[PDB]
């Protein structure tokens, strides 16, 4: 619910190759990096089952190559929240026939992008399951 501070897909070199601040109210590319730094540096590819930072939900994940960040508020249950996060790995994996890689990332961004807008759009998750998508999309 207009609830994504950003969803970022971050490299684990603290880099971010995706960020959409769906919702935002703080700025700076730097501060974004800084903010990123404290937490990323700290989580350092390691993640947690759950993590709350800022009273805010941090659901983040890692892949086998990439670090997934979503920032949200601990003010909206894990199970769902994760479900979207889950949705993110999985569909990308199946559809593409391949999940995220650094390589994958490097060849083309777009698909992520395409997906992303569809799934979520700002601080409101319009959707969180693949299938609909799968049919819906045909690129």
């Amino acid at each position: 619910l207009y609830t994504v501070k950003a969803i970022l897909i971050l490299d684990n070199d603290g880099d971010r190759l995706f960020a959409k601040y769906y919702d935002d109210t703080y700025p700076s590319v730097k501060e974004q990096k800084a903010f990123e730094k404290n937490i990323f540096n700290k989580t350092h590819r390691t993640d947690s089952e759950i993590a709350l930072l800022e009273g805010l939900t941090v659901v983040y994940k890692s892949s086998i190559d990439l670090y997934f960040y979503v920032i949200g508020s601990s003010y909206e249950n894990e199970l769902m929240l994760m479900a979207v996060l889950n949705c993110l790995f999985d569909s990308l994996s199946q559809m593409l026939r391949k999940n995220v890689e650094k390589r994958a990332l490097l060849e083309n961004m777009e698909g992520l992008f395409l997906a992303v807008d569809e799934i979520v759009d700002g601080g409101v998750i319009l959707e969180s399951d693949p299938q609909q998508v799968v049919h819906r999309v045909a690129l």
């Binding site: 207009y2 947690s48 759950i50 249950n77 894990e78 319009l126």
Partner: protein
């Protein structure tokens, strides 16, 4: 990498017709990438880009249709024109590539404007409403950003508008409701009848449920009415399904028991607790911290041990580590187990999911439950704290020290003893600064001089001009106060301990020199650093000068009356004031609606039981949420039978003027309507001071002598005072007496011989002999030193 430049040049690619969707798309992609990564640039170029891009648009090249959406999408609250597409939007609108249509509208809406708002509208209406769920969704999202801006344009449509929200897809159903988050922001009543709709049907989206919960909950705090059945109803509903989140959600708030609900709910909860109890919902941790609150009830507590023991045991899962601290805390602990744990902790804390942070939080809680208190623990802890350490204690210390002060701890001798020592050989200059400052104030109120000195010397012992310096500064509050031996010696010491090292020399010299400069006693001082309540109201009232008599206020209102009921636009609370001569009703308020400001305001009162009516006063202007004063004035007749208790009839008159709150307008025109004004009744307690007599014996009789009226009733269906009692103590506001007041939850006989003095000076006196034979027959006397009161009391008491 990113850079704008290639691309602007590269815009000439637009010039080709032989292109591949891929080829261009990529180029398009490149620009978008710089940006996805981040870019910043000029409008001119953007505008240009548009044109350039825009330029291309023969095709339906589908792919082409998307990219632009993006592109455009990039611009929304910080845009550049709107018009250009327009056609293109319409083109979709008649044009069945369904798909496409939806993305485009959506961007526009942060970017929007009102004229242009006009545009979509008949259709739009349709459109939101239209067909396949998919399309409809697309529609929705679009508003919201426009809602930022506004959305009321929409809003209006509403009686009619909502009904379509009626759904047949889950996902959708969930969605409908948030828009209703703002809908319910707008309205509460609506919900209520509404709920019975929400309540009415079982729901689809777990998701839909959730918003309701918050809400539902939100409602509950003060009570969501007789949640009994609803709460219950809900209770199942939250309770089970195939979607976990609800059960949990419900669970955390709902406890209820300090000697309260625990019934089913504890079992269900237990099913859950246990069920969760290994990261099903790693959620479980948070809850214990507050969401599902714990501070227990006594047998209840004992039961809790096992669950906490699992976490305590497991030591893993970030979600686990946190959980360990809250559960243990909330439920509390025995000393003994702590011991086992201290060792566990010894390893654990450093990183064990990065335990230190949870722990600092835990620790902050520790400092609080014992902030220098269970000092033995504080010391055990202290030893341990320092010990287990790392370094990370310091941070904690900032809290801990603070805690100790909060108590203003008293096993300081010991507490301090540990602190002092350890800190010495637990280092960090920084801590010292803080503590110094505090200590600085405290000194000889807590004695133990030799020790304290003993310490102090040590603190200084350390090098640092700076470290040294603090002992002297702390000392000033101390010195000045002196202790169990200090003044003589205090004088001796500064002498005994002295230093060179220039600026360090200087510090000694200077303090001295400073010392040198004031009489040390003085030195220390500088450096170291009726005509009631209601009468006041008679005066407060006095600043006005339109009077037509007043007097001095005698007593004031026994109860202020809201003259407009609850949360009304013209919300009124009124207070009534009595003087020996006049009574003023001064009217307190919040011309409520931001709709209105009321102007040309005066207050009518029309009376039944006497007062001479001098004037109705109103406030000149009353804007929203802001007391202003209006008054109504009377002079009080005192020696008449029936002449100061009155009910007065109220009608509010005003010329009603509309507001723009943004920036208003205040103009001569606007038209009146008048609204009913609530009654004012005047009491026998706005006027009276309740008393004890100057001469009861005599007075008691005497008051009879001159004054006395009577009423008798014989009570045959009820043999209880109590009804009578409710009207009399309370109406008169006087004292029941002659040690003839008291009755337990029963009593055989009762007299109130009762007192206070009425306005206009003279007194109003009452004797109520209530007599129980076993019927009650009773003699009520009112006797008075004022004529108007005897008739009055008999009435008034009712």
């Amino acid at each position: 990498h990113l850079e704008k430049s290639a691309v602007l040049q590269e815009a000439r690619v637009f010039n080709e017709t032989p292109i591949n969707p891929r080829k261009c798309a990529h180029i398009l992609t490149k620009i978008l990438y710089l940006i996805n990564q981040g870019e910043h640039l000029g409008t001119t170029e953007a505008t240009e880009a548009f044109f350039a891009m825009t330029k291309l648009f023969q095709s339906n090249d589908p792919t082409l249709r998307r990219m632009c959406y993006l592109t455009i999408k990039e611009m929304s609250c910080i845009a550049e024109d709107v018009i250009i597409v327009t056609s293109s939007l319409t083109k979709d609108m008649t044009g069945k590539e369904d798909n496409y249509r939806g993305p485009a509208v959506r961007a526009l809406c942060q970017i929007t404007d009102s004229t242009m708002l006009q545009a979509v509208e008949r259709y739009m209406k349709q459109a939101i409403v239209d067909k396949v769920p998919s399309v409809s969704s697309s529609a929705l999202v679009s508003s919201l950003h426009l809602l930022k801006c506004s959305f009321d344009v929409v809003k209006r449509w509403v009686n009619e508008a909502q009904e379509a929200a009626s759904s047949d897809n889950i996902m959708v159903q969930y969605h409908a409701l948030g828009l209703l988050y703002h809908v319910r922001k707008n309205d509460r009543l609506a919900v209520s009848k509404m709920i019975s709709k929400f309540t009415r049907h079982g729901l689809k989206s777990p998701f839909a449920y959730c918003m309701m919960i918050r809400v539902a909950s939100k409602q509950l705090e003060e009570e969501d009415g007789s949640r009994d059945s609803p709460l219950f109803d809900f209770i199942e509903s939250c309770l089970r399904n195939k979607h976990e989140m609800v059960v949990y959600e419900a669970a955390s708030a709902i406890v209820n028991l300090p000697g309260c609900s625990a019934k089913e709910l504890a079992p269900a909860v237990s099913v859950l607790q246990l069920f969760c109890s290994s990261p099903k919902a790693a959620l479980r941790y948070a809850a214990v911290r507050t969401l599902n609150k714990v501070a227990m009830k006594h047998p209840s507590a004992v039961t809790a041990c096992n669950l906490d023991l699992e976490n305590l045991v497991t030591d893993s899962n970030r979600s686990i580590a946190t959980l360990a601290i809250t559960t243990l805390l909330k439920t509390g602990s025995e000393s003994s187990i702590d011991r086992l744990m201290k060792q566990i902790s010894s390893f654990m804390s450093e990183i064990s999911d990065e335990f230190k942070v949870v722990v600092v939080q835990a620790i902050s809680a520790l400092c609080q439950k014992y902030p220098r208190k269970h000092a033995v623990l504080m010391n055990f802890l202290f030893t341990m704290l320092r010990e287990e350490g790392g370094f990370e204690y310091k941070r904690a210390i900032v809290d801990c020290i603070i805690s100790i002060i909060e108590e203003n701890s008293e096993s300081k001798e010991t507490g301090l003893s540990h602190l002092c020592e350890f800190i010495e050989d637990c280092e960090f200059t920084v801590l010292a600064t803080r503590i110094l400052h505090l200590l600085g104030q405290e000194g000889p109120k807590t004695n133990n001089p030799s020790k304290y000195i003993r310490f102090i010397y040590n603190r200084v012992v350390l090098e640092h001009e700076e470290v040294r310096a603090g002992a002297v500064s702390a000392l000033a509050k101390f010195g000045a106060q002196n202790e169990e031996m200090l003044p003589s010696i205090l004088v001796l010491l500064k002498r005994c301990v002295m230093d060179d090292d220039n600026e360090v020399r200087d510090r000694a010299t200077f303090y001295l020199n400073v010392l040198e400069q004031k009489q040390k006693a003085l030195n220390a001082g500088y450096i170291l650093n009726a005509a009631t309540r209601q009468e006041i109201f008679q005066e407060q009232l006095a600043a006005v000068p339109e009077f037509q008599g007043l007097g001095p206020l005698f007593k004031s209102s026994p109860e202020p009356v809201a003259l407009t009921e609850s949360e009304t636009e013209y919300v009124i609370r009124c207070t009534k004031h009595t003087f020996s001569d006049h009574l003023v009703f001064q009217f307190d308020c919040t011309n409520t609606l931001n709709d209105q400001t009321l102007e040309n305001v005066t207050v009518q009162m029309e009376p039944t039981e006497a007062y001479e009516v001098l004037s109705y006063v109103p406030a000149r202007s009353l804007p929203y949420n802001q007391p202003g004063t209006c008054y109504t004035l009377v002079a009080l007749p005192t020696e008449d039978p029936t002449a100061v208790a009155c009910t007065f009839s109220c009608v509010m008159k005003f010329t009603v003027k509309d507001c723009d709150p943004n920036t208003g307008e205040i103009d001569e025109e606007g038209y009146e309507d008048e609204y009913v004004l609530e009654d004012l009744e005047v009491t026998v307690a706005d006027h009276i001071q309740k008393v004890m007599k100057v001469n009861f014996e005599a007075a008691w009789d005497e008051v009879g002598d001159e004054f006395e009226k009577e009423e008798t009733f014989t009570l045959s269906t009820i043999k209880t005072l109590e009804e009578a009692v409710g009207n009399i103590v309370k109406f008169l506001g006087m004292h029941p007496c002659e040690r003839s007041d008291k009755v337990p939850e029963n009593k055989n006989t009762h007299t109130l011989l009762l007192a206070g003095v009425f306005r206009g000076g003279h007194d109003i006196l009452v004797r109520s002999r209530l007599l129980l034979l076993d019927t009650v027959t009773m003699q009520v006397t009112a006797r008075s030193s004022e004529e108007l009161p005897v008739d009055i009391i008999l009435a008034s008491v009712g």
